[PDB]
Symmetry: C3
Subunit: 149 residues, 3 copies
């Protein structure tokens, strides 16, 4: 009996695991996730970069990163307003790197940017028309997380 | 080995508890929940107050309750139209109480409200400009639920 | 130990099943599902009919099918643009059938439609009028899935 009860419970667990994965898929679909594309989402809350990283990380996601023009637009329509991107030049000034590793490939800088203005700007925000501006990491901007395709 | 399978089941169950919690957090984030703030949700359906209470309760939430101006604005944005609040003077005419207990403190009544008009009005709806009006609990207004910060 | 732990895990599993069901109810509510009404959802992506079917099937739903004028309007409101319906005459030209099975009990064809125009049209799209037009199953239109009341 015990071996049988255990086997039956293992079957229930597998079913429940599939049901939760279905829940995640239906949720992403309902929130706009496109086939074969990363899922971008925001709660429309503005906060310093460190908080955005902690928040996305707590959801098992990462701060949104545009790898190409298409993703840059996708992020732009989700945010609506100025939002941090998962990019910083904290290591070597002028050398922007993804918070998940690697050198910046695609970029969409606004004219005269990046200018590492004032006391310094090592974070990046996507703003009007999807263009980018480097800004202080301590400034508050919209939190946008990304989840894998 | 019976005990080995049992220990794996325990790990499978704890992994699922953690993943469901992550799924709940992501959904709340996607629906606009701000850090440290309770969040509001609606399906935009209009119904009598008793139905709204029953629906929210079943979801382990309560009819939305504005505790201050920020929350009042957040509920107004979510609702988009007249919606019941978790406030009534059903128990003792004239004394509004939160559905979850306690006397009403912060309020945002329209001029000349509440007035327990006619045969009586024991419920409350947030309306235009976000101001409040006491209304019949039998009237149908938008169902808006709140969930804990 | 063994038998007590086993009985506890059965309760842990049932608790998780109840919690997941609640999570699903909350997600549907936030998605706009109305009491006793089936609900339609979209990620706003446009794709060929075969991909819409594969996508909704994977989410355990079906391609949206209006059964009366109310549901037809509801699908029209969710899609916002042209969207495939779960109706085709792929099996026998001229005979439209629900993907779930059977002959139509309701239709809202635009004048002189369906006409299997040009190279052929075996799928159906609800347009920006609520009216229907048969169109190529290979053309890309908005994916709208349906889930039970
Ligand atoms: Ca620097
Ligand atoms: Ca810099
Ligand atoms: Ca700058
Ligand atoms: Ca009274
Ligand atoms: Ca009077
Ligand atoms: Ca009263
Ligand atoms: Ca009144
Ligand atoms: Ca044909
Ligand atoms: Ca045809
Ligand atoms: Ca046609
Ligand atoms: Cl900085
Ligand atoms: Cl009343
Ligand atoms: Cl076709």
């Amino acid at each position: 009996a015990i071996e049988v009860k255990l086997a039956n419970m293992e079957a229930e667990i597998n079913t429940l695991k599939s049901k939760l994965e279905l829940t995640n898929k239906l949720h992403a679909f309902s929130m706009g996730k496109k086939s074969g594309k990363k899922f971008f989402v925001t709660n429309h809350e503005r906060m310093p970069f460190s908080k955005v990283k902690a928040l996305c990380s707590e959801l098992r996601g990462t701060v949104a990163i545009p790898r190409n023009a298409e993703e840059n637009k996708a992020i732009q329509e989700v945010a609506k307003t100025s939002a941090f991107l998962g990019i910083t030049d904290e290591v070597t000034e002028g050398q922007f790197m993804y918070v998940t590793g690697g050198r910046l490939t695609y970029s969409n800088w606004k004219k005269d940017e990046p200018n590492d203005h004032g006391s310094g700007e090592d974070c990046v925000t996507i703003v009007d028309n999807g263009l980018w501006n480097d800004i202080s990491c301590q400034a508050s901007h919209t939190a946008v997380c990304e989840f894998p395709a």
